[PDB]
Design an enzyme around this catalytic site. Structure first.
Site, mmCIF file in Angstrom:
data_model
loop_
_atom_site.group_PDB
_atom_site.id
_atom_site.type_symbol
_atom_site.label_atom_id
_atom_site.label_comp_id
_atom_site.label_asym_id
_atom_site.label_seq_id
_atom_site.Cartn_x
_atom_site.Cartn_y
_atom_site.Cartn_z
ATOM 1 N N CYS A 1 25.005 -5.156 9.791
ATOM 2 C CA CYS A 1 24.031 -4.317 10.485
ATOM 3 C C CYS A 1 24.671 -3.546 11.638
ATOM 4 O O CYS A 1 25.532 -4.068 12.345
ATOM 5 C CB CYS A 1 22.869 -5.166 11.002
ATOM 6 S SG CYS A 1 21.460 -4.209 11.604
ATOM 7 N N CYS B 1 -4.772 -3.169 5.875
ATOM 8 C CA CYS B 1 -3.814 -3.650 4.883
ATOM 9 C C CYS B 1 -3.207 -4.992 5.280
ATOM 10 O O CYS B 1 -2.829 -5.199 6.433
ATOM 11 C CB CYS B 1 -2.703 -2.621 4.667
ATOM 12 S SG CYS B 1 -1.638 -2.989 3.259
ATOM 13 N N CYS C 1 0.805 -1.219 0.000
ATOM 14 C CA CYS C 1 0.000 0.000 0.000
ATOM 15 C C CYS C 1 0.841 1.274 0.000
ATOM 16 O O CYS C 1 0.296 2.378 -0.031
ATOM 17 C CB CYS C 1 -0.939 0.014 1.206
ATOM 18 S SG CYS C 1 -0.110 0.354 2.773
ATOM 19 N N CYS D 1 35.480 -4.148 -12.502
ATOM 20 C CA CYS D 1 36.630 -3.721 -11.715
ATOM 21 C C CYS D 1 37.827 -3.546 -12.640
ATOM 22 O O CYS D 1 37.994 -4.319 -13.583
ATOM 23 C CB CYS D 1 36.938 -4.739 -10.617
ATOM 24 S SG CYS D 1 38.556 -4.554 -9.820
ATOM 25 N N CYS E 1 23.926 1.616 18.953
ATOM 26 C CA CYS E 1 24.442 1.764 17.598
ATOM 27 C C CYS E 1 25.965 1.709 17.574
ATOM 28 O O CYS E 1 26.635 2.374 18.364
ATOM 29 C CB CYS E 1 23.954 3.076 16.980
ATOM 30 S SG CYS E 1 24.493 3.341 15.274
ATOM 31 N N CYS F 1 40.153 8.657 -8.713
ATOM 32 C CA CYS F 1 40.718 7.633 -9.584
ATOM 33 C C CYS F 1 39.618 6.953 -10.387
ATOM 34 O O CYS F 1 39.814 6.608 -11.552
ATOM 35 C CB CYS F 1 41.501 6.598 -8.776
ATOM 36 S SG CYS F 1 43.118 7.163 -8.207
HETATM 37 ZN ZN LIG Z 1 43.066 6.748 -5.858
HETATM 38 ZN ZN LIG Z 2 0.322 -1.770 3.677
HETATM 39 ZN ZN LIG Z 3 38.317 -6.539 -8.422
HETATM 40 ZN ZN LIG Z 4 23.753 5.604 15.002
#
Ligand SMILES: [Zn+2]
Ligand SMILES: [Zn+2]
Ligand SMILES: [Zn+2]
Ligand SMILES: [Zn+2]
Ligand SMILES: [Zn+2]
Ligand SMILES: [Zn+2]
Ligand SMILES: [Zn+2]
Ligand SMILES: [Zn+2]
EC number: 2.3.2.31
Lengths: 298, 76
Positions: A265, A60, A28, A149, A280, A123
């Site tokens: 995390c 919902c 929703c 890369c 945290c 770079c």
């Molecule tokens: Zn660099």
């Molecule tokens: Zn919802």
């Molecule tokens: Zn790489």
């Molecule tokens: Zn924090």
């Protein structure tokens, strides 16, 4: 500077900034959605229907979370206002040098290769700028015109093309044009040989007589005027290994015990017996709501 | 929002559009401005051919960004 999310803001900033992570109901689209499992990586955020939860919109029955981003350098305008995640850009908290100039920069660009090589943004600009001029960008069937890369590692192609917004606007406009030109060439298509007109034309599988929009009728195979019959006629491994993204401890705000970061995390619960504090890792304090927005993971 | 549609010729078209607009709807806007049949239109962003079913928001296409128009000529 406690941000861990970098976005591209088209309007009105027209540049790359820090970003705020948001979550709403996938069903929703209401901002009131409670997450069951905190995001630990970019895949949790970008891939769809990866995290379940509860929607606070009454009635919902949605179960999945939708993660989006906002620019943190301008006040939001409307519910539609969103920003594009630049997932490869990270905080160089490990103080990892660049593979090219060996500089400890912040923030950095970390390629998604199995080996995770790290480059500073300057770079990266020079890396893209050089490989664009030499038509060295690859024409990927899934990701479009992109780059891997610099070391050329497996599965390291850039998927979010707005990482190239790190480039000059002239280069970015050039990036798209070259992207279109070699899309045509890779698809078996053709470009009108005329000087005034180089129209991109997707001809049929076996087509000799090509007539561009400009009216010019030319041969698809030899790119000359239409005819019948046969057509006449530097990376140092020492630097790279050290500039590698793939011990560290921080004290708990509630009991001063030594703690280590498990996953990506930043929301951490003290494992100690007496203390189950929510804190945290970045702020070294209590887990706030803005921690989710500013640096939930990374 | 407005996006640009640019050809490799250099001709540029401005289109007032919404993020929830399908590419099919974008093509119609081009035909309404250039007469080009949608069957001959093909839009490419960052080297990817946009499919009519998907919308602009699906490709993270921002305001003041440019799509590329390429012709699909048949018969060749
Ligand atoms: Zn660099
Ligand atoms: Zn919802
Ligand atoms: Zn790489
Ligand atoms: Zn924090
Ligand atoms: Zn902004
Ligand atoms: Zn032509
Ligand atoms: Zn020929
Ligand atoms: Zn504790």
């Amino acid at each position: 500077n406690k941000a861990h999310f970098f976005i591209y803001c088209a309007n009105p900033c027209k540049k790359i900034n820090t970003g705020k992570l948001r979550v709403c109901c996938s069903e929703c689209k209401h901002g009131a959605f409670t997450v069951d499992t905190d995001p630990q990586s970019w895949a949790d955020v970008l891939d769809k229907n990866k995290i379940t939860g509860v929607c606070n919109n009454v009635g919902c029955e949605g179960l999945y979370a939708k993660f989006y981003f906002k620019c943190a350098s301008h006040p939001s305008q409307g519910e539609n206002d969103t920003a594009v995640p630049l997932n490869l850009i990270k905080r160089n908290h490990k103080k990892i040098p660049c593979l090219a100039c060996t500089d400890i920069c912040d923030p950095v660009l970390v390629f998604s290769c199995d080996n995770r090589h790290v480059t500073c943004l300057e770079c990266f600009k020079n890396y893209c700028g050089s490989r664009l001029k030499d038509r060295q960008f690859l024409s990927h069937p899934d990701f479009g015109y992109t780059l891997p890369c610099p070391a050329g590692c497996s599965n390291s192609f850039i998927e979010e093309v707005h990482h190239f917004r790190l480039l000059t606007d002239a280069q970015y406009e050039q990036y798209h044009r070259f992207a279109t030109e070699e899309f045509i060439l890779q698809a078996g298509g053709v470009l009108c040989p005329q000087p005034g007109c180089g129209q991109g034309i997707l001809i049929d599988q076996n087509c000799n007589r090509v007539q561009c929009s400009c009216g010019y009728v030319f041969c698809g195979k030899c790119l000359e005027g239409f005819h019948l019959g046969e057509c006449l006629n530097p990376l140092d491994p020492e630097k790279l290994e050290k500039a590698r993204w793939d011990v560290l401890t921080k004290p708990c705000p509630k009991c001063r015990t030594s703690t280590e970061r498990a996953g990506g995390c930043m929301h951490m619960i003290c494992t100690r017996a007496n203390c189950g504090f929510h804190w945290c890792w970045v702020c070294q304090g209590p887990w706030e709501r803005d921690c989710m927005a500013s640096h939930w993971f990374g | 929002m407005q996006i640009f549609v640019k050809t490799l010729t250099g001709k540029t078209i401005t289109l007032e559009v919404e993020p929830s607009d399908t590419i099919e709807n974008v093509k119609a806007k081009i035909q309404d401005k250039e007469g080009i049949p949608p069957d001959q239109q093909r839009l490419i962003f960052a080297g990817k051919q946009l499919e009519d079913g998907r919308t602009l928001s699906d490709y993270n296409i921002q305001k003041e960004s440019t799509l590329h128009l390429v012709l699909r000529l048949r018969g060749x």
